[PDB]
């Protein structure tokens, strides 16, 4: 039973994490054989590579869209063969879903995590008034966004913000930029709002992924800045040893390894020619499988590492 998967780029940290577990799954089943793909950033190369994979025959696809929106794309691909995909981490359109009787998709509640990072947020302000700057009760904040259009930037921007609001803390957006989840893009983008006019004026770091985060407490070192604090969203090791040493103030954890579980597990199963849940305990709503996000900081570091 062989499976073909594609993954946006192998570069993507936390995307890492989920293809080694996928990986796992797959060298454990003696019956299946995952054929592994890095699309290196470029949709028009995951889609040649799709179109290799069908080639070889393949009996399900599990793909990491470099695009959500080319989504419709892969599906009329794989219905060429009737062969199942499982789309996962990048959400397709509810549209592009629903036109295939074969299409899956595993992710997350995207909002969540963006309610989750506010209320922490909302948390350390309180327990530090010192972090108000300028003294006017409101947080003066940057926010470095993931890829646009991608449903996780565009929720977790902003949720985070709107839950802030929501418990009665104002705030005051400085800048905004997307460094496309990037480590290095983020650390250039925060390095030049460290080097501009409002550099003094910025109480707090929001950062859609720990990726991002970790650029941007790497140029508030090199700025001497690092009592700003920084917030991130996916518990990356990286991020949560940041977490101990206080570099970073919060993170939330992305559940890389039930996403994995649930997207290896779906495709197996479809590749068999079985309802996409037999054996599991998975919860597929209209084809849909969401996995639960926590929050993680100093106070209850300990349940994660
Ligand atoms: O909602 C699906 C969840 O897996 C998306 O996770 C994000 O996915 C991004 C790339 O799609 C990037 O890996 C970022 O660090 C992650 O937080
Ligand atoms: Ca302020
Ligand atoms: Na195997």
Do not use: C
Not at 19 to 47: C, F, H, T, W, Y
Not at 105 to 116: H, L, M, R
Request: glycine fraction near 8%; aromatic fraction near 6%.
């Amino acid at each position: 039973t062989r499976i073909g998967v594609t993954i946006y780029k192998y570069d993507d940290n936390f995307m890492s994490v989920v293809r080694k577990a996928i990986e796992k799954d797959g060298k454990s089943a003696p019956d299946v054989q995952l054929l592994m793909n890095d699309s290196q950033n470029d949709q028009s190369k995951q889609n040649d590579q799709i179109d290799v994979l069908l080639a070889k025959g393949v009996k399900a696809l599990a793909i990491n869209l470099v695009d959500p929106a080319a989504a419709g794309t892969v599906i009329e691909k794989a219905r060429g063969q009737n062969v199942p995909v499982v789309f996962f981490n990048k959400e397709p359109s509810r549209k592009a879903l629903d036109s295939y009787d074969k299409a899956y998709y595993v992710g997350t509640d995207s909002k969540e995590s963006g309610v989750i990072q506010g209320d922490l947020i909302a948390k350390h302000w309180q327990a530090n008034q010192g972090w108000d700057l300028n003294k006017d009760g409101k947080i003066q904040y940057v926010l470095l966004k993931g890829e646009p259009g991608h449903p996780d930037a565009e929720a977790r921007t902003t949720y985070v913000v709107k839950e802030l609001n929501d418990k009665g803390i104002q705030t005051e957006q400085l800048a905004l930029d997307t460094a496309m989840w990037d480590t290095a893009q983020a650390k250039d983008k925060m390095d030049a709002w460290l080097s501009g006019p409002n550099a003094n004026k910025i109480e707090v770091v929001i950062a859609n992924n720990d990726a991002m985060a970790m650029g941007a407490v790497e140029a508030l070192k090199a700025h001497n800045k690092s009592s700003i604090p920084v917030f991130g969203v996916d518990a990356l090791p990286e991020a949560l040893a940041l977490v101990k040493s206080g570099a970073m103030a919060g993170t939330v954890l992305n559940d890389a390894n039930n996403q994995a579980k649930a997207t290896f597990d779906l495709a197996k199963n479809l590749a068999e020619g079985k309802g996409a849940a037999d054996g599991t305990s998975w919860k597929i709503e209209n084809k849909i499988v969401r996995v639960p996000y926590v929050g993680v900081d100093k106070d209850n570091l300990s349940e994660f590492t």
